[PDB]
RNA sequence: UCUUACUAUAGUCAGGACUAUAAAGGUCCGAACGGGUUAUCGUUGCAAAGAUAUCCGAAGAACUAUGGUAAGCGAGUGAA
RNA sequence: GACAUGAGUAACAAAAAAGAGUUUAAGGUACCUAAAAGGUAUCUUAGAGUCUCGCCUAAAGCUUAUGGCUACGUCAAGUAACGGCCUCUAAGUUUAUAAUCUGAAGAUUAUGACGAUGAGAAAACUUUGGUACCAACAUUUAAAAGUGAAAAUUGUGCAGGAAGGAUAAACCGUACCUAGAAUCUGAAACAAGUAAGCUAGUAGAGAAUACGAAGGCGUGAAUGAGAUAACAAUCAUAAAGGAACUCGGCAAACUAACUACCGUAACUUAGGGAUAAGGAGAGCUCAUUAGUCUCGAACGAGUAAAAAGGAAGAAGCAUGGAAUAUUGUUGUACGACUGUUUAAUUAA
RNA sequence: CUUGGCCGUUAAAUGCGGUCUUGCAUGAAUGAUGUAACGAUACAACAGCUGUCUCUAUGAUUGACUCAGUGAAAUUGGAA
RNA sequence: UAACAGUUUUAUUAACCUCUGGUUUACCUGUUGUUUAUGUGCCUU
C-alpha cells in the first residue's frame, strides 16, 4: 500500500452492502409448535422421536 | 483369519464347573485318547525326569505369567508366551527382581512325564485363549471392553488370577484329551493324583473350587535357599 | 547465516570445556571465575 | 452457449507463452497490458482481458430452408445455430437477400 | 496434413524415393490431397532428380482422414506425392500405387491419366 | 511328512500369528483342544 | 472452460469418493438411517436406490453387483435380498428419502440432512406425522390438508398400513409426548 | 560439540557381474549410505539452503561414531 | 510505549482419507413437573471406545541411545536375561615430582597421576612370538538338514596390520519421547536432520520392485463443510506431422531388468573397446524322465515333490501380462585416468 | 582485421570437421605433439523419440472462489 | 419435358458438434502381482 486507508473508505468496504441478512424463512413445527426453519425438521422433535423409536419398537 | 467365540454357556469336560457358564460337567466329547486309557504312560522320547514337575512364574507387580518345564525361565519363554498388549507393556527382558515363582505342579507318577507335558499344554492353550478370545470379560467381570486401550492392555497382562483358575480346571480334567484322566475300559474313568506347591497360600483362592485329586503344599523347592519365605494365611 | 552447531552435542564435552574444574585448575580459568564472581553471576560455569 | 469466466486464449485467441523453455508460472497468461509512461501510464480502454464469455445474442445469416413439415412443426435449416438444445431462437427472412416473391407473401397472408 | 519437415513417399519414376516437405504453396493451412508443396529429395531409387534437389510436388494420398461431400471418409497408411514442374506438369511418366480421388476436383487430370487405381 | 528336502512344496502359512491381536479380541487362529470349553472365571484380587 | 460436472466430487479423490458412498449405503442398510451432510445424502441416494433395484432382480449378475457395493456382503446380503427385497416389491422407485435438518456440527454450520429408507422401522416422517395427529387428537383440532397428505404417503405401501400408524399415535399419547406443545391457534400471537 | 586436517579406539558397505585368484582390482551394474549434475517448484518458503524428479560415487584417496590435538602480532587448517 | 493501516485479507494444501453409531464426567439451554428433585432431548468443554474404509511397513512399527523446560511410587550382588562405579591402559591431559631451559607468564624431558570411543575371572547355578597373532579379505568348523552370529582353524595380498593389566553382596542409572501426529537439534506444535537392534508373509539374485499380518497413524478446530471460473502447481491422454520450438532437444518421450542365449566394428598402451552395435527367448496348459524323493509290492504308480523338458497346445488386441533398472551412434577441443574444490549462485 | 580462402555437412553454415596459412598477439617440462581408455566438462552431426513446436484441447487432484472458526506481514506525511 | 451429369481458391472472424477426430478418474470387457472377506475344497475302509 502506498498510503494508509482513511476511516471513510474502509467503513465503505466494511459495511456498505455487507450487512448480515435476517433469517425470514421460519415456520412452526407441526408437532410441538417451536420455531423451526422452512423445509427443515424440528431439532427438538427429531431428537425426541429419534430416541423414542430406540426404546420401544 | 481368526474365529472368536461368544460368551455363551457350554459343557465342560472337567469334574467341576470352571465358570458360571459351564452347564454340564464330566461330559465326554470324544473317545479316550491313546494314553488316556493307560495306567502308566511313560517318558517315551523325552529326557529323564522331564514332565514330572511344572513351574509357573509371575510378575509380582503386573501379573504376567510364564509356564516353564524347567525350574527357571529364559528369554525364549517371554517371547513365545507374551503377546503384544500395547506400548511399554511388554518388557524387553526378564528382570530377576520382579519375576518370582508362582506355583509348582508335581504329579504322583515319578516317571509318567507324559501326563505333565499334557497339563503344560492345556495351560498354555488356556492362556492364549485368555489373552485372545476373552469374550467372558468384555461386558462382565473386569469389563475390558469398557476400558481404554492403555488400561485394557494392563488388565490383559494380569493373567495371575486366570492362571490359578486354569490349574484348577486343567487338573480337574478340563481340555479335550488331556492325560489327567485314566479310563479303565474294563467303562470307568478317574483322575490322577497331583500336588501344587504354593509360594503364597492366598493365591490358591483365585479358583472358586479345587478338584479332589490335588493336594496343596506351601513353599516351592529351592525357594528357601534364596532366603524367600512363603506367605501363610494362618501364620 | 547461523548453523545447527549444537546437533549431536553431548553434556560430557560441556563439562570438559566450560566446567568448573577446567577453570579452578588453570591460570586463565581463575580469571573467568573471579570476573564472573565480581559481576555477581550465580552460574560460574556450565 | 454460456462459457463462464474465460481466459485470454478461449476469449480472444491469445497465443499464450512457452511451455518448458524456462517459462515461470506464465503459460496461459496474457503478458503485457500496455505500454509505459509514454502511452498514458494506464491500461487503455477496450483492452482485451479475461472475463465472462458467451450467453450473448448471435445471428447466423443466409441459411436456406431444407425441409418444412407442418405435422412435426419443424423447420430444418442448413448449418449451425447459436445456443443449446431446447432454447428459443428467432427465425426471420434474410436482410441481405431480396424478399420472397410477391405471390408467396400474398399466398401466406391468404 | 503435410507441413514443414514432413517426410513423404514419392510414387513416380522421377528418381526420388523419400522427399521432405519444405513449403506449402498457396495457403497457410497444412496441405491435403491435391495441394502443391516444395520438397527436397532425401533418397533416390535404383534426367532423374538427385538427392538434395528442390522440386514441386502434389499430395496424392495422406494418412490423415479426408472428409468428402457424401460423408465418405478415406484414410491411407502413408503420405505420398508425385513431383511436378513449376508449370504444373508431372515429371515422371508412370505412377506406381493408389492415389487419392480428390485430385479430380483440384485440376490434376494429368496425374490421374496414369493413375492405375483411385481411392 | 512325505518329502523332507529343504525345497519341498511349501503349503503352510509361515505367518503363524496372522490376524491375531489381544487388544482387538481377534480370537485364536486355529481350533485348539481347549477352544470348545468356557474360559474358567477366577475370583478377582 | 470444459464440461460441467456430472456429479459432486466432494473434494475427494476417485478412490476416496467411491468408498465414501459405499460406506454411507452400507451404514444405511445396517442402521436403516444415517444423519450426514446434505450433499453426501444426495449422492448416496442415487447409489442406495440403484442397490435396492439390484435386490429386486433375479439374475446372479445383480447378486454380484450388490456384493461389490457393500463392505460386509456376507453380513448384509441376506438382509438386502431378504427383508428389503420384500419391503419394496410393489413400490416403483423412490425407496429413499432425504429430509433437511439443522447443522449436525455447529462448528462448521454445514447443512445436514437425514437419508433414510421409506417404510422402515426408523422412518422419521412417519413418526413426525404420527406426532402431529397425536397432537391434533389431544387438542381437539383439525388436521391440515398437508397432514392428511403425509398420512397417506407413509401408509400406502407399508405392510401393516394404517394399523402401524394408529399404534404409533396411540403410543405417543399414552406417553404424553405432546406435553407442552403450542396449539396452532396461538402461533399468530407469538413473537419468540 | 559447526567446519578443515591430523590422531586414538571402534563401526558400516543388499545382491549380482567381469577379471589371474576361494581371497591380489583407487574394476563394472545397482540399493543402503555418501555426494549435489540438470530441471521445475518455493522466494514475507515446510526450510535464514527445503521438496520432487533426474543424475554421480557406492572395496575405497571410501563413509560414519565417541574422544583428543592445532586458530587469532607471527597466521590455525587447507587435493588451494 | 500504546494504538491504527494493509485486513477480518493471506495463511492453517508432506498428494494417507475419511464415513456412520455408542458412551463417561462437569456445566449451559428447552420441555415435562411446580414437593424440591428427577426424567427426555439438545449444546459446550475435556475424554474414551465399536464397526467400516484408507496410509506407513528395511516405517509413519516395537525395543533402546545422544539428548530432554515432557512427568516424578522408575524396586537388580553377578550370569542366563545389566550398564555404570571399580581394575587396566590408547590418543592425549596435568597449578603433581625431579632435572633442565626461560624477560615474568611459562616451556621441555623423565616419572607419577589422570584419561574410553577399547580390554576385564567364573555362573542354571557362580564368587612363548608362525611353538605366533587376533588388522583386512577368503575359507572351514556346535553333526538330521539349511540359514545367521560368536569364537576358532587354514590360507591369501601388501599397504605388513594397539597398549596395559592380568585370571553374602553397598552406591548410581531403570519413568516417558525417538520425530507422519503433542517431548531430541534446526529461534517453534518446522515437509529438514540424528545412533544401535529387531523390523510377519507372498515373490525375487537381492535390504530392488509390488502387496501388507501385527502395530501405529489418518495432527491440540493448528480447521471443517461446499462449489469445481480464469490462472498456477503437480500429473494423465492425444488426430496428422515429428525439433518446424529454442541461445541450446531445456523439459518430456523413446529406450530399460532378466538368460549360465546368439552375435558384436574402427581403433588399441594388447588389458580393452564391449553389457558395443544388432537379434532371440519369457506367462498359462501339457507329452516326456537318467538320477534324487514319495507310495505300493526288481518292477509298477505318482509333481497334493524339487527339477529337467520340447519344432506340443489353448485363449486374448497384447503373455519383460501390473510395479522397479532413462535411448543408440559419430567427429573434435580441454584434462590421461579414480578422485578433490568456493558449507548456502561458478563441480569445471 | 573476419562470417579469412577452399572442401565436406545443411534446401539455405557467422557453426562444426578437414585443409591452405603472411601467426594484430603459436611453440617446446609457465612443457610441444598424436592415439587407446575414461567424463553429470564444452561444441557439432545422425537415427529413433516425443505436446518442444505447427496449435492447442479435454480430464484428475490440491489451491484459487463461497460459508463457519482462528487470525499475519511488508507498507503508510495527510488525501474528497 | 422428364431423367442423368457438371457448376472456385485463399485468408480471416464468429458460431456450432451432424460428420472425421481428441478427451473419458462413479460405463462395459479382458488381464498381471498381492491382500482381505465369504463359499467351497484331497485319498481310503
Ligand atoms: K495511472
Ligand atoms: K562436499
Ligand atoms: K550392580
Ligand atoms: K618464563
Ligand atoms: K533431457
Ligand atoms: K510361448
Ligand atoms: K570423474
Ligand atoms: K463432434
Ligand atoms: Mg521403559
Ligand atoms: Mg557461518
Ligand atoms: Mg557433531
Ligand atoms: Mg452451461
Ligand atoms: Mg502453446
Ligand atoms: Mg510450470
Ligand atoms: Mg495523465
Ligand atoms: Mg476444501
Ligand atoms: Mg487407485
Ligand atoms: Mg567434533
Ligand atoms: Mg568401483
Ligand atoms: Mg511465487
Ligand atoms: Mg563408474
Ligand atoms: Mg556404482
Ligand atoms: Mg486485498
Ligand atoms: Mg482473495
Ligand atoms: Mg485461502
Ligand atoms: Mg446435559
Ligand atoms: Mg588410571
Ligand atoms: Mg566403555
Ligand atoms: Mg517434524
Ligand atoms: Mg520423518
Ligand atoms: Mg522442535
Ligand atoms: Mg524398499
Ligand atoms: Mg509413533
Ligand atoms: Mg480426520
Ligand atoms: Mg500428437
Ligand atoms: Mg500417432
Ligand atoms: Mg531451428
Ligand atoms: Mg525460429
Ligand atoms: Mg488371437
Ligand atoms: Mg579430469
Ligand atoms: Mg556454491
Ligand atoms: Mg552447483
Ligand atoms: Mg618452459
Ligand atoms: Mg474465512
Ligand atoms: Mg452426438
Ligand atoms: Mg461403479
Ligand atoms: Zn417440534
Numbering used by the authors:
A (entry chain W): 66 to 122
B (entry chain d): 33 to 218, 243 to 291
C (entry chain Y): 95 to 140
D (entry chain C): 221 to 330
E (entry chain I): 1 to 46, 59 to 131
F (entry chain T): 44 to 88
G (entry chain L): 2 to 193
From the reporting publication:
Protein synthesis in mitochondria supports bioenergetics of eukaryotic cells and is executed by dedicated mitoribosomes. To provide a representative reference for studying protein synthesis in the mitochondria of fungi, and to reveal how the mitoribosome functions in coordination with its translation partners, we determined structures of the translating mitoribosome from the representative fungal model organism Neurospora crassa. The fungal mito-ribosome consists of 78 different proteins, 23S and 16S rRNAs. Forty-eight bacterial orthologs are extended, and 30 proteins are mitochondria-specific.
After subtracting the signals outside the tRNA binding sites, followed by focused 3D classifications, we obtained three distinct classes with tRNAs occupying P-site (P/P), E site (E/E), and in the hybrid P/E state, at the overall resolutions of 3.05, 3.10, and 2.99 Å, respectively. In the P/P state, the anticodon of the tRNA forms base pairing with the mRNA in the conserved P site of the mtSSU. Further stabilization is provided by the conserved C-terminal Arg315 of uS9m, which forms salt bridges with the backbone phosphates in the anticodon loop of the tRNA. The conformation of P/P tRNA is overall similar to bacteria. The A-site finger, known as a functional attenuator and important for keeping the correct reading frame, takes in a straight conformation forming the inter-subunit bridge B1a. The conserved G2453 (G2251) and G2454 (G2252) of the P-loop form base pairs with the CCA terminus of the tRNA, and the emerging peptide is bound to the terminal A76, waiting for peptidyl transfer to the next incoming aminoacyl-tRNA at the A-site. In our structure, the density for an endogenous polypeptide is detected and the involved structural elements at the upper part of the tunnel are conserved with respect to the geometrical parameters, such as the length (~30 Å) and average radius (~5.3 Å). The density for the nascent polypeptide can be traced from the starting point at the peptidyl transferase center (PTC) until the beginning of the lower part of the tunnel.
